Each structure stands twice: as C-alpha cells, then as structure tokens.
Symmetry: C2
Subunit: 144 residues, 2 copies
C-alpha cells in the first residue's frame, strides 16, 4: 500500500532490491559495523594488537586534539593507546601483548579489550555526527 510503495521505493534507493512485506507484514534487514583488528609479530617478547579505526582526517587539527585528549581516559582506565600511523594515515588503537605466559584465551581477551575501546571510540564520534573515512554501514534484507 502506501507503505509497500515506500518499502520498495526505499529498496530502489538503498541499492539492494526486490523488497516486500511478507505474510506477517514484516520485512527484516541486517546491518553491521565491521571492526578491523591486526596482529603484528612485533618483536620476540611482545606482539602488537592494532584496532584500525579508519583513515584520519589530517586536515582537521581540532580532531587530532580531541583524540589526543581522549587518551587521558585511556590512560586512566585500561589502555589501548590512541595513535596515528603515518603510512596509511589511519587512526590506530594500540595495545602490546606480552608473549611470556601468553595464551589464546589471553590473546582473545586482549583483542576484546581493543574492540571494546573501538566500540567506545566510535559511539562517541557517532553521537557527535563524526564519521571517519573508511566507515561503511552495509545493509541487506533477510528472512523476516
């Protein structure tokens, strides 16, 4: 109806297509925030975990400062360091991982710490409208 016409006109404009309300008058969708993590075989005592947050706006100094300021918070609590990797010019959340007494479960938790930091970093940016460059919200329908 006036809805189906919107549901569909929504599809044609959203990229994916052939969308319609099912039997129960529902039309479900899945969306996701994909988080990038990288493990670096740094040296022989430590391993480095990087939470790649996306390209950094290197033309906005006001941003670099609210990031640098956010470190106070990461300095008080847990600890991934907020950094800038010149090469790919990205925003990085860094956390060294000690190999001594290492364990996949410890590695699992340390990686979880970094992603929870990204969660928090993002929420704050999202709640301020900010959106890094390599950020993409992928949508697609599923069985309602």
């Amino acid at each position: 109806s006036r809805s189906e016409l919107l549901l569909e006109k929504f599809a044609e404009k959203i990229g994916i297509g052939s969308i319609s309300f099912n039997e129960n008058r529902l039309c479900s969708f899945a969306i996701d925030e994909i988080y990038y993590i990288s493990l670096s075989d740094a040296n022989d005592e430590y391993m480095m975990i990087y939470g790649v947050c996306g390209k950094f706006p290197t033309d906005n100094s006001n941003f670099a400062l609210e990031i640098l300021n956010a470190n106070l918070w990461f300095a008080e609590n847990g600890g991934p360091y907020l950094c800038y990797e010149a090469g790919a010019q990205s925003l990085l959340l860094a956390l060294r991982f000690p190999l001594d007494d290492a364990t996949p479960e410890k590695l699992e938790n340390e990686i979880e710490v970094v992603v929870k930091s990204m969660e928090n970093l993002y929420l704050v940016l999202h709640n301020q409208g900010i959106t890094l460059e390599n950020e993409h919200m992928k949508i697609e329908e599923i069985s309602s």
Copy 2:
C-alpha cells in the same frame, strides 16, 4: 681593555641575561644549564593515582604537530607506557601514567615518577632533534 675573546664572553653574557662574567686565572669560565621537568601527582580515584609529565603548552594552531605526537604514541604504546595526552584546561602536552595503590610503596612511586621523567626525556630529545620546541647561570671554574 680586553682580548676579543674576553669581549665575546662579555657580549655573550650581557646578551644571555646574566651579568659580569670573565675567564678565571685558568682562562676558564663555566656555566650550568638546567633542563627542568615538571611532574604532578594526582589523587584521582581511591584505587589508582595519576602521574603527569607536564611537557609544556600545546601549540593548538599546528595540525601537523598534533599528528606527530599522535604518531609518537605508537612508540610509547610498544614500550612501558606513559600516554601522550592533551589537556584542554591548560592546553598542555601531558605524559600520563596511572599508579596503583594496591601494594604501593614510595619506592614504587619513585620508579614510576622516574619512568615518566625518562619518557619526557626521550620525547624532548626527539622533539629537539626535529628543531621543535614548546636556564643558564654562570658557576665556579
């Protein structure tokens, strides 16, 4: 009258701010130059304390600077760990490190204060070896 050597010493002295300088009987004249480091202990919460290395006033006009400091944090991130932070209030460049009270001892507080100092030392040296920048007095020879 004085040799152009003594002359230079004097013009140097008067220009540097200190006054009345000359070469002693041995043709010597010594100075002491200080590189002060400001540390601040903070009674943050009741489970952790916070050691701050106040490095100076952060030039908030330079987009490039902020980025170089952020890139330096990669280094601190690999090593022990004082964080390179920015404090809006005083617009200062901070080197932050938390200190746990559980089993704390002045010895532990002394080591920690000393790591922040050494971090400020690696920082300033990398900053100065870049020409970047955010007290001399004569003494006995």
